[PDB]
Amino acid sequence: AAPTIFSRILDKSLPADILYEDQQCLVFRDVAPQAPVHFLVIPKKPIPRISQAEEEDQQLLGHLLLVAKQTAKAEGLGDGYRLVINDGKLGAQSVYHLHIHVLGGRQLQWPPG
Amino acid sequence: AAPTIFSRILDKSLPADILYEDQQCLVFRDVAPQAPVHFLVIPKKPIPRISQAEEEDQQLLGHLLLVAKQTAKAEGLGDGYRLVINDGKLGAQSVYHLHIHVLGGRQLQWPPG
Ligand SMILES: C[As](C)(=O)[O-]
């Protein structure tokens, strides 16, 4: 039944560098950054993976992408960035709580893994 | 906005392998695939890049993520996949019309470019 590590970031049990918070979501820096700017946008609702989002999540999912781009701008990513959502094993999903990676501050390569 | 190659996919002047279409969006296979399954989810509203989405796009943005995961399921991506949105030069955004890449059918690496 126990929730993921992200539930303990959300309830502030685990210290994190939090960039933004509202009643729907939380934004915090990734502690294993893959770029000079690397942060995560997560819903408070513990959707485990994008494959398990439902129609009722439409507004929340749109809010997560708007918060990602608002936070990218606040972090100074004016020359481009990348949003990544990993689902399951082949996506290399680490924590089974929905998160959007935001990466910037270097040239991102193609393919994206 | 200037016409892009996506304008020619949307008006069906440029043939594509179209997986899904509704009032709000179009889904078609990427012609330079980076994985055995690689398709694009695009809005019909020509938002040039995620950095230029606005609050009024919330419902559309949520719809694009739900169509991405519904189409991933229809394409048999039950072992995981990756969603990628590129913004601007450092994101390696090729076409200035908002698109979500969906990649599956192989193990995606980390970092994601
Ligand atoms: C051919 As493309 C739209 O993945 O840069």
mmCIF file of C-alpha atoms and ligand atoms in Angstrom:
data_model
loop_
_atom_site.group_PDB
_atom_site.id
_atom_site.type_symbol
_atom_site.label_atom_id
_atom_site.label_comp_id
_atom_site.label_asym_id
_atom_site.label_seq_id
_atom_site.Cartn_x
_atom_site.Cartn_y
_atom_site.Cartn_z
ATOM 1 C CA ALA A 1 0.000 0.000 0.000
ATOM 2 C CA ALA A 2 2.938 2.406 0.857
ATOM 3 C CA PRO A 3 3.443 5.316 -1.539
ATOM 4 C CA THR A 4 6.678 6.096 -3.472
ATOM 5 C CA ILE A 5 9.646 8.333 -2.570
ATOM 6 C CA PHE A 6 7.748 11.201 -4.378
ATOM 7 C CA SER A 7 4.950 11.041 -1.716
ATOM 8 C CA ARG A 8 7.655 11.802 0.896
ATOM 9 C CA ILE A 9 8.895 14.787 -1.222
ATOM 10 C CA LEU A 10 5.243 16.040 -1.499
ATOM 11 C CA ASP A 11 4.630 15.819 2.298
ATOM 12 C CA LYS A 12 8.093 17.474 2.892
ATOM 13 C CA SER A 13 9.480 14.444 4.904
ATOM 14 C CA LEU A 14 12.457 14.521 2.449
ATOM 15 C CA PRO A 15 14.199 17.859 1.782
ATOM 16 C CA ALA A 16 14.145 18.915 -1.894
ATOM 17 C CA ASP A 17 14.965 22.100 -3.838
ATOM 18 C CA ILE A 18 11.299 23.007 -4.594
ATOM 19 C CA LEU A 19 10.830 25.521 -7.471
ATOM 20 C CA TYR A 20 6.988 25.691 -7.439
ATOM 21 C CA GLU A 21 3.980 24.213 -5.654
ATOM 22 C CA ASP A 22 0.193 24.481 -5.973
ATOM 23 C CA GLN A 23 -2.690 22.243 -4.917
ATOM 24 C CA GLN A 24 -2.331 20.114 -8.127
ATOM 25 C CA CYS A 25 1.476 19.672 -8.426
ATOM 26 C CA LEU A 26 5.047 20.155 -7.145
ATOM 27 C CA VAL A 27 8.272 21.032 -9.012
ATOM 28 C CA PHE A 28 11.727 20.128 -7.604
ATOM 29 C CA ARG A 29 15.296 19.678 -8.852
ATOM 30 C CA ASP A 30 16.481 16.171 -9.817
ATOM 31 C CA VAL A 31 19.351 15.080 -7.458
ATOM 32 C CA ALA A 32 21.021 13.070 -10.349
ATOM 33 C CA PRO A 33 20.873 15.873 -12.943
ATOM 34 C CA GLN A 34 21.469 14.924 -16.629
ATOM 35 C CA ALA A 35 21.814 18.619 -17.644
ATOM 36 C CA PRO A 36 22.826 21.908 -15.923
ATOM 37 C CA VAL A 37 19.045 22.451 -15.386
ATOM 38 C CA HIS A 38 17.089 19.266 -14.577
ATOM 39 C CA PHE A 39 13.845 19.399 -12.615
ATOM 40 C CA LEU A 40 10.718 17.270 -12.209
ATOM 41 C CA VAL A 41 7.036 18.285 -12.430
ATOM 42 C CA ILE A 42 4.818 15.834 -10.502
ATOM 43 C CA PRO A 43 1.108 15.747 -9.731
ATOM 44 C CA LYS A 44 -0.019 15.509 -6.079
ATOM 45 C CA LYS A 45 -2.493 12.879 -7.309
ATOM 46 C CA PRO A 46 -0.294 9.728 -7.339
ATOM 47 C CA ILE A 47 -0.903 8.575 -10.964
ATOM 48 C CA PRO A 48 1.842 5.893 -11.159
ATOM 49 C CA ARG A 49 2.621 6.285 -14.907
ATOM 50 C CA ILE A 50 1.223 8.108 -17.962
ATOM 51 C CA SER A 51 -0.162 4.732 -19.236
ATOM 52 C CA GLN A 52 -2.500 4.771 -16.143
ATOM 53 C CA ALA A 53 -3.785 8.377 -16.575
ATOM 54 C CA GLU A 54 -7.558 8.495 -17.351
ATOM 55 C CA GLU A 55 -9.922 10.979 -19.084
ATOM 56 C CA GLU A 56 -10.681 12.623 -15.682
ATOM 57 C CA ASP A 57 -6.929 13.601 -15.527
ATOM 58 C CA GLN A 58 -7.171 15.788 -18.692
ATOM 59 C CA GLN A 59 -7.095 19.161 -16.814
ATOM 60 C CA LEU A 60 -4.298 18.021 -14.429
ATOM 61 C CA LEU A 61 -2.163 16.735 -17.374
ATOM 62 C CA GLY A 62 -2.540 20.067 -19.190
ATOM 63 C CA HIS A 63 -1.665 21.895 -15.943
ATOM 64 C CA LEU A 64 1.551 19.768 -15.587
ATOM 65 C CA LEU A 65 2.709 20.813 -19.102
ATOM 66 C CA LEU A 66 1.869 24.526 -18.435
ATOM 67 C CA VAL A 67 3.759 24.378 -15.098
ATOM 68 C CA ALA A 68 6.704 22.686 -16.886
ATOM 69 C CA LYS A 69 6.946 25.525 -19.447
ATOM 70 C CA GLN A 70 6.328 28.301 -16.817
ATOM 71 C CA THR A 71 9.118 26.813 -14.639
ATOM 72 C CA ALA A 72 11.478 26.364 -17.643
ATOM 73 C CA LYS A 73 11.057 30.123 -18.287
ATOM 74 C CA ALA A 74 11.663 31.008 -14.564
ATOM 75 C CA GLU A 75 14.840 28.810 -14.707
ATOM 76 C CA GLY A 76 16.114 30.861 -17.690
ATOM 77 C CA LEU A 77 15.693 28.162 -20.425
ATOM 78 C CA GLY A 78 15.104 30.720 -23.214
ATOM 79 C CA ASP A 79 17.271 28.925 -25.856
ATOM 80 C CA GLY A 80 15.322 25.621 -25.718
ATOM 81 C CA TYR A 81 14.803 22.585 -23.459
ATOM 82 C CA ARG A 82 13.305 19.078 -23.494
ATOM 83 C CA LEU A 83 10.318 17.563 -21.632
ATOM 84 C CA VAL A 84 10.492 13.796 -21.068
ATOM 85 C CA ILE A 85 7.923 11.370 -19.635
ATOM 86 C CA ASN A 86 9.160 7.804 -19.040
ATOM 87 C CA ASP A 87 6.588 4.941 -18.927
ATOM 88 C CA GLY A 88 7.575 1.464 -17.656
ATOM 89 C CA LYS A 89 10.722 -0.602 -18.252
ATOM 90 C CA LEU A 90 11.441 0.326 -21.910
ATOM 91 C CA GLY A 91 10.995 4.048 -20.938
ATOM 92 C CA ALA A 92 13.535 3.595 -18.070
ATOM 93 C CA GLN A 93 10.880 4.887 -15.566
ATOM 94 C CA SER A 94 12.716 5.081 -12.158
ATOM 95 C CA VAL A 95 9.870 6.070 -9.734
ATOM 96 C CA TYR A 96 6.304 4.855 -10.402
ATOM 97 C CA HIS A 97 4.795 8.297 -9.751
ATOM 98 C CA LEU A 98 4.076 10.353 -12.916
ATOM 99 C CA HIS A 99 6.823 12.942 -13.526
ATOM 100 C CA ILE A 100 7.860 15.245 -16.365
ATOM 101 C CA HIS A 101 11.626 15.722 -16.612
ATOM 102 C CA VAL A 102 12.630 19.235 -17.769
ATOM 103 C CA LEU A 103 16.233 19.364 -19.079
ATOM 104 C CA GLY A 104 18.082 22.450 -20.291
ATOM 105 C CA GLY A 105 21.306 24.447 -20.194
ATOM 106 C CA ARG A 106 23.065 22.271 -22.836
ATOM 107 C CA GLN A 107 22.447 21.025 -26.393
ATOM 108 C CA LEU A 108 20.166 17.975 -26.129
ATOM 109 C CA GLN A 109 21.015 15.196 -28.618
ATOM 110 C CA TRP A 110 18.849 13.142 -30.976
ATOM 111 C CA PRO A 111 17.766 10.438 -30.509
ATOM 112 C CA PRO A 112 16.461 11.100 -26.956
ATOM 113 C CA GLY A 113 17.923 7.805 -25.667
ATOM 114 C CA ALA B 1 2.217 31.547 -38.650
ATOM 115 C CA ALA B 2 4.248 30.462 -41.743
ATOM 116 C CA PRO B 3 3.163 27.065 -43.134
ATOM 117 C CA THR B 4 5.291 24.084 -41.884
ATOM 118 C CA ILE B 5 5.591 20.503 -43.213
ATOM 119 C CA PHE B 6 2.977 19.610 -40.458
ATOM 120 C CA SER B 7 0.458 21.958 -42.243
ATOM 121 C CA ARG B 8 0.781 19.643 -45.291
ATOM 122 C CA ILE B 9 0.248 16.520 -43.103
ATOM 123 C CA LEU B 10 -2.838 18.167 -41.486
ATOM 124 C CA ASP B 11 -4.404 19.144 -44.888
ATOM 125 C CA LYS B 12 -3.493 15.618 -46.254
ATOM 126 C CA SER B 13 -1.471 17.118 -49.240
ATOM 127 C CA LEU B 14 1.571 15.226 -47.784
ATOM 128 C CA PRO B 15 0.685 11.537 -47.289
ATOM 129 C CA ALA B 16 1.431 10.110 -43.841
ATOM 130 C CA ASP B 17 0.621 6.935 -41.882
ATOM 131 C CA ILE B 18 -2.146 8.472 -39.703
ATOM 132 C CA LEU B 19 -2.938 6.466 -36.529
ATOM 133 C CA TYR B 20 -5.652 8.750 -35.054
ATOM 134 C CA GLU B 21 -7.465 12.021 -35.734
ATOM 135 C CA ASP B 22 -10.118 14.094 -33.964
ATOM 136 C CA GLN B 23 -11.235 17.767 -33.892
ATOM 137 C CA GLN B 24 -8.244 18.730 -31.687
ATOM 138 C CA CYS B 25 -5.267 16.670 -32.965
ATOM 139 C CA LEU B 26 -3.617 14.292 -35.443
ATOM 140 C CA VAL B 27 -1.307 11.301 -34.806
ATOM 141 C CA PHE B 28 1.080 10.018 -37.512
ATOM 142 C CA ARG B 29 4.259 7.928 -37.783
ATOM 143 C CA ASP B 30 7.599 9.784 -37.825
ATOM 144 C CA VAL B 31 9.303 9.350 -41.260
ATOM 145 C CA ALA B 32 12.820 9.231 -39.587
ATOM 146 C CA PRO B 33 11.936 6.804 -36.781
ATOM 147 C CA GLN B 34 14.346 6.587 -33.787
ATOM 148 C CA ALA B 35 12.669 3.383 -32.474
ATOM 149 C CA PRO B 36 10.607 0.470 -33.921
ATOM 150 C CA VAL B 37 7.506 2.513 -32.907
ATOM 151 C CA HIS B 38 7.875 6.301 -33.298
ATOM 152 C CA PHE B 39 4.830 8.516 -33.843
ATOM 153 C CA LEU B 40 3.916 12.171 -33.326
ATOM 154 C CA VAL B 41 0.873 13.696 -31.579
ATOM 155 C CA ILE B 42 0.186 17.238 -32.866
ATOM 156 C CA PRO B 43 -2.584 19.727 -32.097
ATOM 157 C CA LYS B 44 -4.570 21.175 -35.020
ATOM 158 C CA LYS B 45 -4.104 24.600 -33.371
ATOM 159 C CA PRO B 46 -0.598 25.534 -34.624
ATOM 160 C CA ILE B 47 1.058 26.250 -31.206
ATOM 161 C CA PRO B 48 4.658 26.621 -32.484
ATOM 162 C CA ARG B 49 6.400 25.293 -29.335
ATOM 163 C CA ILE B 50 5.522 24.308 -25.752
ATOM 164 C CA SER B 51 7.220 27.546 -24.520
ATOM 165 C CA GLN B 52 4.419 29.493 -26.368
ATOM 166 C CA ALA B 53 1.439 27.453 -25.027
ATOM 167 C CA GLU B 54 -0.888 29.633 -22.848
ATOM 168 C CA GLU B 55 -3.381 28.970 -20.005
ATOM 169 C CA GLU B 56 -6.230 28.701 -22.594
ATOM 170 C CA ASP B 57 -4.368 25.618 -24.061
ATOM 171 C CA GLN B 58 -4.687 23.634 -20.780
ATOM 172 C CA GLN B 59 -7.464 21.275 -21.986
ATOM 173 C CA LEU B 60 -5.820 20.751 -25.418
ATOM 174 C CA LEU B 61 -2.436 19.941 -23.759
ATOM 175 C CA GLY B 62 -4.099 17.365 -21.472
ATOM 176 C CA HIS B 63 -5.919 15.897 -24.509
ATOM 177 C CA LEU B 64 -2.554 15.546 -26.387
ATOM 178 C CA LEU B 65 -1.061 13.495 -23.475
ATOM 179 C CA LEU B 66 -4.205 11.276 -23.226
ATOM 180 C CA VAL B 67 -4.175 10.663 -27.011
ATOM 181 C CA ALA B 68 -0.404 9.867 -26.755
ATOM 182 C CA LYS B 69 -1.037 7.186 -24.101
ATOM 183 C CA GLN B 70 -4.236 5.804 -25.834
ATOM 184 C CA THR B 71 -2.271 5.523 -29.125
ATOM 185 C CA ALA B 72 0.756 3.960 -27.337
ATOM 186 C CA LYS B 73 -1.635 1.258 -26.026
ATOM 187 C CA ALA B 74 -3.167 0.698 -29.542
ATOM 188 C CA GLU B 75 0.411 0.398 -30.952
ATOM 189 C CA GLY B 76 1.171 -2.400 -28.416
ATOM 190 C CA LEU B 77 3.587 -0.412 -26.166
ATOM 191 C CA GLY B 78 2.668 -2.386 -22.991
ATOM 192 C CA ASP B 79 6.351 -2.786 -21.860
ATOM 193 C CA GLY B 80 6.980 0.986 -21.650
ATOM 194 C CA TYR B 81 7.650 3.984 -23.885
ATOM 195 C CA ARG B 82 8.929 7.568 -23.767
ATOM 196 C CA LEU B 83 7.127 10.872 -24.545
ATOM 197 C CA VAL B 84 9.409 13.701 -25.674
ATOM 198 C CA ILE B 85 8.603 17.376 -26.369
ATOM 199 C CA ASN B 86 11.445 19.459 -27.819
ATOM 200 C CA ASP B 87 11.504 23.271 -27.411
ATOM 201 C CA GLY B 88 13.814 25.475 -29.549
ATOM 202 C CA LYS B 89 17.453 24.964 -30.623
ATOM 203 C CA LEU B 90 18.891 23.380 -27.434
ATOM 204 C CA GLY B 91 15.866 20.984 -27.393
ATOM 205 C CA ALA B 92 16.654 20.028 -31.042
ATOM 206 C CA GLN B 93 13.059 21.035 -32.087
ATOM 207 C CA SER B 94 12.994 20.332 -35.895
ATOM 208 C CA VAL B 95 9.462 21.642 -36.838
ATOM 209 C CA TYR B 96 7.971 24.780 -35.156
ATOM 210 C CA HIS B 97 4.577 23.111 -34.643
ATOM 211 C CA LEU B 98 4.080 21.536 -31.166
ATOM 212 C CA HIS B 99 4.509 17.736 -31.279
ATOM 213 C CA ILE B 100 4.865 14.943 -28.719
ATOM 214 C CA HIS B 101 7.202 12.139 -29.871
ATOM 215 C CA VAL B 102 6.109 8.687 -28.658
ATOM 216 C CA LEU B 103 8.969 6.113 -28.876
ATOM 217 C CA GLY B 104 8.758 2.405 -28.035
ATOM 218 C CA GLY B 105 9.681 -1.143 -29.064
ATOM 219 C CA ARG B 106 13.279 -0.820 -27.766
ATOM 220 C CA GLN B 107 15.019 -0.022 -24.473
ATOM 221 C CA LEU B 108 15.318 3.764 -24.277
ATOM 222 C CA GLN B 109 18.569 4.938 -22.633
ATOM 223 C CA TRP B 110 19.339 7.536 -19.938
ATOM 224 C CA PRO B 111 20.094 10.388 -20.319
ATOM 225 C CA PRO B 112 17.349 11.159 -22.905
ATOM 226 C CA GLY B 113 19.844 12.929 -25.205
HETATM 227 C C1 LIG C 1 11.365 13.898 -38.759
HETATM 228 AS AS1 LIG C 1 11.207 14.706 -36.922
HETATM 229 C C2 LIG C 1 9.428 15.557 -37.064
HETATM 230 O O1 LIG C 1 11.290 13.446 -35.687
HETATM 231 O O2 LIG C 1 12.504 15.856 -36.475
#
